[PDB]
Chains A and B, each alone.
Chain A
Amino acid sequence: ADHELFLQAFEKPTQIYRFLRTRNLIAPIFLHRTLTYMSHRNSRTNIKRKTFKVDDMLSKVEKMKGEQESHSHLQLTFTGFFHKVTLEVLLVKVCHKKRKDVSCPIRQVPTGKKQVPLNPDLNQTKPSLAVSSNEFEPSNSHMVKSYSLLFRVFVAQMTVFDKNRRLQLLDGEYEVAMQEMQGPTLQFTLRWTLRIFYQFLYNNNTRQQTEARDDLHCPWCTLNCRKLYSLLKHLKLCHSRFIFNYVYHPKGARIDVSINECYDGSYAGNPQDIHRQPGFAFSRNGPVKRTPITHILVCRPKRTKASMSEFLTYSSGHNRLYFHSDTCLPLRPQEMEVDSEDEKDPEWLREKTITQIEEFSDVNEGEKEVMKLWNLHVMKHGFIADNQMNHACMLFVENYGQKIIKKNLCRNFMLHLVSMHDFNLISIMSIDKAVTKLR
């Protein structure tokens, strides 16, 4: 028995949910505290009134207390650079990204530069000073995300303000390091101036046994289920690709798990897109027409109480893809219209009748041609009643009157009329009428 089967059987689903886990922890679909069987969550209550015309007042006083203090130019001198040439200093302003911007805009403006010594050493000094005014302005609080300082000779950076506009720099003598494109460094000074077990089945061919650790937490999504009832409900509803059974081992809990047989999960969008040629499928860049459908899924819940013992949606419209009768090709929504692709007169029959007629040898052309012409016309309309015949012949010469005259075969047509009258369908009152109408 190649166990790689078992592994490969259970390897595909797990990863999926694993990915979803990392997504769900950051991209929620619904609050788990609103779930009916997760009621222990959301410990708060709806009991509250909170009239609005006072909320501002609570804030109006609060803003008075919130204003603790505020900041009030800068000057800093660079000590000799150290290593195991003029310097460059830049001020970079980062602004908020807008609708037409793909990334946060940045504006690097230089405040100045100075000529620092080429790899000086301590005890050799016996000095360049940078002074910065209030380049930042209050109005910028609406446009600028932040500011930062950049240094080069060789690159280094630092940031002045936090998110809350809180200055992160004090005054003092700092030693820092820099990268290129321990090691190089510089110095400067600044001054402001129940046991649970799991069983895995593989159709009785093989099985695996494990024990849960940190029980009551979902082993896949790590959701904290405080009750066996809620845990079972969540496992059976969310992770639906598996099937679970409750065994109630005396140690406190035992669950046997197998792979779902069908799990009819499939694309639920426009059904036609499944058969679009690659490159056009999932275009999602233009309106598309499709047939109307209507479903219903929730009408009147019962809201029954919890019961551990229990643990041991119609459609309207077209809900499928339709194919052409002959070519077995998908049918477009517009092609579904009154065109019924079915009529009384197939062409292959029209060819077969003529080729079969041509087989006979004891017949001259003057009769074969008339027979074919009459048979095709008869099959065109499909007369079924004898009373129709009086009109039938009338219409016959009405359609082919030019052809027979061109063929010079009216004599055989008259002979056919005589034969028909012999069979009790035509009356003597109409035999001559066909010829009179011919000319």
Chain B
Amino acid sequence: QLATKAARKSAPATGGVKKPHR
């Protein structure tokens, strides 16, 4: 079951780390 999906308040977020020093 669980076919339906309620509307939730969602705040996305993503992030890298760094580039090594050269």
Complex: A in contact with B (CB within 8 Å):
no
Q: Which residues of A pack against B, CB within 8 Å?
A: none
Q: Which residues of B pack against A, CB within 8 Å?
A: none
